[PDB]
Uromodulin (Homo sapiens), 504 residues
Amino acid sequence: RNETHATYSNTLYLADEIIIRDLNIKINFACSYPLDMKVSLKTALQPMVSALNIRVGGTGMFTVRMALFQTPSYTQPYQGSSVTLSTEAFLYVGTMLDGGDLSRFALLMTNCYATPSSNATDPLKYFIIQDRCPHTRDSTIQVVENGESSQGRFSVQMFRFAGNYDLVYLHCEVYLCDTMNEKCKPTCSG
Amino acid sequence: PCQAHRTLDEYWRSTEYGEGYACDTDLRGWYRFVGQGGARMAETCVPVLRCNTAAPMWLNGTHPSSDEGIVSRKACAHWSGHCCLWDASVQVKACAGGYYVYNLTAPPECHLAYCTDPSSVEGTCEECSIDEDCKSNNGRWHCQCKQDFNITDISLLEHRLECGANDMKVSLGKCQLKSLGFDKVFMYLSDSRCSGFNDRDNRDWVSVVTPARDGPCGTVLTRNETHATYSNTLYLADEIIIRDLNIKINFACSYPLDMKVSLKTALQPMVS
Amino acid sequence: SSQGRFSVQMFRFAGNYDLVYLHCEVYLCDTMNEKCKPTCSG
Ligand SMILES: *[C@@H]1O[C@H](CO)[C@@H](O[C@@H]2O[C@H](CO)[C@@H](O[C@@H]3O[C@H](CO)[C@@H](O)[C@H](O[C@H]4O[C@H](CO)[C@@H](O)[C@H](O)[C@@H]4O)[C@@H]3O)[C@H](O)[C@H]2NC(C)=O)[C@H](O)[C@H]1NC(C)=O
Ligand SMILES: *[C@@H]1O[C@H](CO)[C@@H](O[C@@H]2O[C@H](CO)[C@@H](O[C@@H]3O[C@H](CO)[C@@H](O)[C@H](O[C@H]4O[C@H](CO)[C@@H](O)[C@H](O)[C@@H]4O)[C@@H]3O)[C@H](O)[C@H]2NC(C)=O)[C@H](O)[C@H]1NC(C)=O
Ligand SMILES: *[C@@H]1O[C@H](CO)[C@@H](O[C@@H]2O[C@H](CO)[C@@H](O)[C@H](O)[C@H]2NC(C)=O)[C@H](O)[C@H]1NC(C)=O
Ligand SMILES: *[C@@H]1O[C@H](CO)[C@@H](O[C@@H]2O[C@H](CO)[C@@H](O)[C@H](O)[C@H]2NC(C)=O)[C@H](O)[C@H]1NC(C)=O
Ligand SMILES: *[C@@H]1O[C@H](CO)[C@@H](O)[C@H](O)[C@H]1NC(C)=O
């Protein structure tokens, strides 16, 4: 045996008779064993230790945005505090989603409206999108996507609120929906 | 003591200097060694013909730790081949910070002077976080946290879950787990590859960060009609194996589905 | 001897581990050609 194996070496003699006279036969055989084995038990063990559970909680809020766009195709964001338009000029907007798990949710739009102010609860409201769908009584409104992915967009002609109202804002309301659990796309018709 | 001392900016007191003849007979009072020679004076009997002296001196035993006060020591003298043949009286007082003081007395005869080994100027105490007192144990400076930071039960264990939109994380006070009986902790999610790490925002914190998706580190999302909550279990053990007090902090936080969104630009048209 | 036995308190790996499996690798030696007695001290 050397440092690794251990050989058992012996020689075998074969003949057809008691006495040998030609072609002596020697079966020189040796089989070795390595010195290092690998062993493991065949039983799984399941101990038990007491577990103290401190169940703690929290709440989170996702990040989601809304940018004015200088151009059609919804490519670049407005950065000025105020934008001047003609009434005939078309408005071009869209909403971003950076909250998290963008694979699972679909940015879906319950309702958006226009008020002369930043007060979201201003009673004077023009629902620019009404119940997940564009108004049909207004035809200048058109949508490209809502709830199709994490980003919805749409365009419409500018207006002004009748009266002493020279300003218009956009308060929109978004609802997350699972893209596999339920179908999110609202397909409305008159 | 710590405020009434005279500094000695002399680089020739080091144990590496070749040879000399200066003996200190006029030295009286508290002294604070400053410079390249060292901040502490010798702990072992430095061999003959060093410290700019034929027979150099040393202090026997160990330097005092923080919060020890006046300590009586007998500074020996090495000469002729017998360490500690002559003796002088020295009183060491530890000080809050990285220096020491001594009443450096006149040795019984000339050809005797103290030494300054390089000591532990490399060992700094700024590495201790702000709430870690600059305490010492037998001459080495350690970051002992507040003794008022002493909680016995683990139900009082501190944890800050900030439910960030893009990612989830729970941060734990390192001092409080230290005093809870944990030297090194092993914090683990439902998957141990989400191993813990250290971060400092206002104090020493140990934290894990996990993406808020369904699956990647075993967090579970159960979106009911209103909320979309993500729950993962936290595992604490101060070593590889737990033998008692198995710890399971069940942390979670929900994300809504509805939310309000508006631009940040005003809008005004012009019309005939 | 030709038998290697030993004891230890049961334990448990921290994390999501509900099982412990044991896996040993043995080394055979000559009782006469070398000293197989292992002695370790701190
Ligand atoms: C310690 O001693 C052991 C026991 O002898 C020794 O292992 C042996 O090594 C030799 C040298 O490699 C092997 O000799 C054989 O020689 C011929 C070719 O030279 C072939 O028969 C063998 O190769 C075969 O390997 C596989 C075996 O099935 C097959 O792929 C195929 O048959 C190949 O032909 C082999 O080289 C001898 O077989 C081994 N014995 C073992 C491994 O059990 C070891 O090398 C020594 N260690 C030292 C000296 O450091
Ligand atoms: C959908 O799943 C969500 C996610 O869990 C679930 O919301 C949960 O509602 C319950 C019931 O209100 C909350 O249970 C908590 O329990 C204790 C007291 O019982 C407290 O922690 C909470 O009350 C706190 O409420 C305010 C929170 O700041 C504070 O006034 C104060 O801290 C109160 O202690 C609360 O009642 C549980 O926390 C929420 N989960 C959250 C918020 O993540 C919801 O009910 C489910 N909807 C269904 C099934 O329709
Ligand atoms: C937003 O507009 C409303 C209506 O002008 C403001 O006044 C509130 O109106 C509601 C009914 O719509 C009353 O019940 C409340 O008492 C009113 N006050 C408050 C403080 O809610 C409201 O104040 C405005 N909010 C903002 C943030 O501008
Ligand atoms: C050394 O510290 C001592 C203790 O505070 C200071 O006073 C000495 O006290 C001892 C013990 O009572 C006396 O035997 C010494 O005579 C005192 N020394 C002196 C110089 O009065 C002492 O001042 C410190 N030594 C120095 C040089 O400051
Ligand atoms: C000083 O301490 C050293 C080493 O610890 C020891 O050998 C020596 O006896 C001590 N001297 C006195 C005077 O006690």
Notes: The two ends of chain C are 25 Å apart (CA to CA).
